Ligand SMILES: CSCC[C@H](NC(=O)[C@@H]1CCCN1C(=O)[C@H](Cc1ccc(O)cc1)NC(=O)CS)C(N)=O
């Protein structure tokens with residue numbers, strides 16, 4: 001746990017790749033050389049072993065020895081760290097660059113008194129790591145680039161002079177990743193100097209004196225973020241890739257060896273959904289329903305995305321202008337709920353583990369349950385084994401299952417292989433913890449991925465964390481896992497650019513609580529700033545998915561802006577109305593049809609809805625999804641306001657005839673406004689007054705004045721009406 005590693009494990013990596021060849025008195029010669037090589041992180045030494053590279057500690061002219069006499073006068077003038085030109089058979093260290101990694105260092109009595117030589121040695125090692133190893137997993141990259149740039153553009157123009165070459169300094173603009181591609185032979189060069197300085201004790205201080213973050217890179221990279229590379233290296237070698245697999249395969253070679261043909265079938269089913277057969281729908285449709293089905297232009301519906309309709313259409317053909325009808329719509333509304341592929345994992349994602357949620361029929365809600373509790377039981381054997389310590393399992397993901405919003409800009413419009421930097425930062429932003437409430441299907445050895453898949457996880461399991469082994473090298477995890485984003489950086493892999501995410505599994509508790517603890521704080525604040533009972537429940541968090549960390553920190557800004565854009569007077573009045581009926585501000589990431597605040601109030605189920613946000617009079621609560629995008633609505637906040645408008649439309653009306661409560665927009669005066677200008681604002685607004693008012697509103701109180709004007713320019717009377725109830729409510 002401490003000594004057990006570096007000193008006694010080193011000696012092992014010492015005997016294998018560390019080769020000596022002196023002349024006489026075979027003694028202390030191996031000391032300075034063993035001491036010298038000790039100061040370096042043993043883990044880089046193992047990687048050198050990986051790409052297959054031996055080390056030679058000899059005497060005299062190093063070039064006068066076996067492995068290095070091939071290269072001719074072609075390569076004979078090697079430059080040193082500093083830039084001078086020390087020749088080979090006049091030097092003391094070199095490192096062969098080829099499909100047979102070789103590194104030769106001359107002997108010496110004691111590098112203690114000396115310090116500038118060990119430096120060079122350490123520098124060449126650098127070149128090694130920076131050119132023979134990392135070059136095989138696609139580093140240095142964007143993370144290390146970011147540190148080179150900070151170095152060129154800053155206060156002190158001296159730290160540059162310390163690492164930067166006789167040409168990295170001059171380069172006009174910042175170093176673009178594309179640049180790492182054309183001047184690479186130079187970049188690696190630098191990452192090396194930085195290693196040596198950091199490695200060579202006394203020269204370490206100088207680095208922490210004129211090297212801003214350049215030091216902090218090595219500090220981190222050489223103590224904690226190094227393994228995560230030795231690993232990647234290791235996840236490209238064959239025998240090892242399967243070395244590990246069979247090792248795990250074995251640990252479950254008793255579980256997998258005892259499964260009912262109902263068990264395996266349960267696992268597989270989970271892997272691939274199963275769209276319901278035509279024949280079944282038809283027979284179970286009944287008399288008047290089947291008959292109505294015959295004359296219903298499906299394409300005349302708004303809901304029911306392509307996928308669906310183009311399915312319901314096939315029933316009219318096997319059974320053998322724009323305005324539809326609402327008694328007809330009912331039907332399609334019902335079928336929508338029957339033509340859904342039975343998907344276990346997708347079901348859990350929607351309900352967020354809340355499997356007993358009246359979000360679907362009864363006959364089906366109950367199957368998902370039988371199946372689920374059944375899968376949870378098939379998964380009782382924990383990964384934790386006695387054949388391996390940390391286990392890194394990998395998983396590829398589509399950023400859309402995390403944040404639709406950013407997912408629409410995450411890829412760079414012109415070069416689809418690149419990741420738009422800005423977006424990347426707004427994603428990497430408030431991402432500190434992640435929840436998994438469905439069965440995570442991960443791969444034992446990183447395997448490529450699809451297109452929507454640009455996010456590449458890299459999970460560290462808990463020996464506790466129980467899972468299930470799969471034949472194709474994958475593992476099905478237990479549900480309700482607690483992850484913990486430890487580091488997110490951009491990476492290049494196989495001609496492409498992907499987002500690497502590094503998380504550590506931890507009890508859901510650790511995380512489930514961070515959420516409440518926070519939910520608590522955010523209320524133990526927005527009540528003061530509102531004059532409400534400090535022990536009231538205004539804001540509420542409903543979080544159970546992979547992008548949790550953000551569904552909370554975003555709540556803050558959303559309200560933090562909904563405030564800085566409206567008269568605090570209007571707020572207080574309205575939100576007390578909401579508060580008075582147990583109302584709620586729900587920032588959640590489970591299908592909306594799964595929020596108590598909507599289903600405790602719906603007559604029939606096919607009536608429930610799903611969307612970015614929504615306001616319901618009944619519970620007087622604003623519901624806000626998070627992993628989605630409103631018809632082009634850059635910010636989440638916006639939508640939050642569009643819903644507040646509904647709140648306002650409720651209080652006004654209320655204020656009219658105190659008990660026969662009816663939304664303000666159901667006024668004879670408004671419809672006379674919705675009729676005229678009530679169709680010169682938003683494509684949506686064109687729906688119905690109730691919504692128009694909400695659309696109009698949102699704009700009248702947006703962040704972009706640009707949007708505030710148009711409402712007043714194309715929707716005057718409305719700007720009068722809406723801003724009219726305002727001055728009414730503020731007086732109440
Ligand atoms: C169902 S997942 C989200 C889908 C997203 N949809 C929305 O934002 C839907 C589409 C129609 C309006 N949507 C709403 O969620 C609105 C909220 C809204 C408002 C304005 C806007 O530009 C976008 C969304 N809900 C309500 O008005 C119920 S109170 C989309 N890209 O189609």
Ligand SMILES: [Zn+2]
Nearest residue numbers: 642646691694
């Ligand atoms: Zn609305």
